[PDB]
Amino acid sequence: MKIYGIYMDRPLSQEENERFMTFISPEKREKCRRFYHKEDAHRTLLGDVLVRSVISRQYQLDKSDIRFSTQEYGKPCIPDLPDAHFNISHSGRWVIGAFDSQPIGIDIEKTKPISLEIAKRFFSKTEYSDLLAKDKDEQTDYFYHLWSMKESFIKQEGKGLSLPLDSFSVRLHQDGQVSIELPDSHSPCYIKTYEVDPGYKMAVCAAHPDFPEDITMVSYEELLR
Amino acid sequence: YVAPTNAVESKLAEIWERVLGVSGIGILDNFFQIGGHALKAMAVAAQVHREYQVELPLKVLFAQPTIKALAQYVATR
Numbered sequence: 001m002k003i004y005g006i007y008m009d010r011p012l013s014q015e016e017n018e019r020f021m022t023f024i025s026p027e028k029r030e031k032c033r034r035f036y037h038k039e040d041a042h043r044t045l046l047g048d049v050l051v052r053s054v055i056s057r058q059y060q061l062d063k064s065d066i067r068f069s070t071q072e073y074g075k076p077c078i079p080d081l082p083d084a085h086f087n088i089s090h091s092g093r094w095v096i097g098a099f100d101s102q103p104i105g106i107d108i109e110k111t112k113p114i115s116l117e118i119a120k121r122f123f124s125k126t127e128y129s130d131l132l133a134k135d136k137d138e139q140t141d142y143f144y145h146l147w148s149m150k151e152s153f154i155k156q157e158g159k160g161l162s163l164p165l166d167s168f169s170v171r172l173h174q175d176g177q178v179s180i181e182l183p184d185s186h187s188p189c190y191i192k193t194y195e196v197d198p199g200y201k202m203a204v205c206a207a208h209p210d211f212p213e214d215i216t217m218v219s220y221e222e223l224l225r
Numbered sequence: 226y227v228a229p230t231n232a233v234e235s236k237l238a239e240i241w242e243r244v245l246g247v248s249g250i251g252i253l254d255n256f257f258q259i260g261g262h263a264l265k266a267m268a269v270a271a272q273v274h275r276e277y278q279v280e281l282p283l284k285v286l287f288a289q290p291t292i293k294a295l296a297q298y299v300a301t302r
């Protein structure tokens with residue numbers, strides 16, 4: 001398993017943007033052009049190039065050789081390279097990617113105060129109860145943990161939000177480990193939270209427990225190679 | 226850009242504008258191209274239930290992420 005991160009301390013220049021556009025498919029280019037907000041374009045762009053860069057290095061291909069598809073729920077894959085399982089998430093200044101020889105999910109979300117209404121309506125009763133147990137001091141932060149942990153799972157599985165959020169329960173324990181309640185039956189999965197930035201909650205979901213201790217940062221320059 | 230043509234489209238536009246912090250959304254605008262993402266899709270679905278007592282499955286919003294489609298779904302229910 002490898003986890004790479006890109007921190008957007010500044011916006012992409014026009015040069016960088018145009019150079020990054022060089023690596024991607026015509027379809028992906030038109031998609032980036034259809035974004036109303038530039039930063040959404042940049043996040044999607046960077047994520048695409050991150051996968052191209054990591055997998056091209058690993059298989060000794062050129063970046064632009066990689067051909068993406070998606071399965072029925074929109075999960076991206078590389079049909080030519082089915083052993084190269086990956087997943088991307090982006091929010092705010094972060095673009096992050098996970099890579100493994102088995103299916104993998106990752107999520108990061110910028111925290112913003114928010115009501116518990118989304119948790120009440122969508123999360124499992126157990127999670128809602130856990131959430132209500134936190135002091136007001138901590139409920140936003142715990143909501144974003146739950147959100148990113150659950151999303152790491154549904155992204156690993158590949159169905160995303162077609163999988164009801166109340167069909168499984170996650171818990172972040174005081175020692176820092178995550179537990180998941182699944183009908184197993186279900187194959188093993190493991191969730192790790194990462195603290196990469198105090199304004200953000202991030203988690204990764206993988207088929208095995210061999211996670212890296214920290215993530216590897218990647219610069220724009222490395223990606224422009 | 227396509228302006229809303231009925232009360233359900235306009236209301237959904239108001240809901241989307243408020244969730245996304247963007248003004249003047251057309252009814253063919255793709256939710257995910259104009260700032261939408263999963264967390265905000267949940268907020269959209271919560272406010273549709275509050276407004277219309279209609280359960281908006283998330284997979285429906287992702288499958289057809291325009292106000293026109295969503296209005297259709299919401300109206301017929």
Ligand SMILES: CC(C)(COP(=O)(O)OP(=O)(O)OC[C@H]1O[C@@H](n2cnc3c(N)ncnc32)[C@H](O)[C@@H]1OP(=O)(O)O)[C@@H](O)C(=O)NCCC(=O)NCCS
Nearest residue numbers: 044073074075088089090155158160161162262263287288
């Ligand atoms: C997957 C998921 C929850 C992402 O939500 P998000 O927080 O808005 O987006 P994130 O920043 O965390 O991740 C974005 C990336 O997730 C990846 N992704 C997209 N769909 C995915 C899926 N079903 N499973 C795993 N990963 C997915 C893509 O790499 C995407 O990057 P891009 O949009 O720049 O190309 C969300 O897109 C989802 O639920 N998708 C499924 C919708 C669905 O059910 N469709 C079926 C209709 S019948």
Ligand SMILES: [Mg+2]
Nearest residue numbers: 089090091262
């Ligand atoms: Mg995102």
Ligand SMILES: [Mg+2]
Nearest residue numbers: 089107108151
């Ligand atoms: Mg996400």
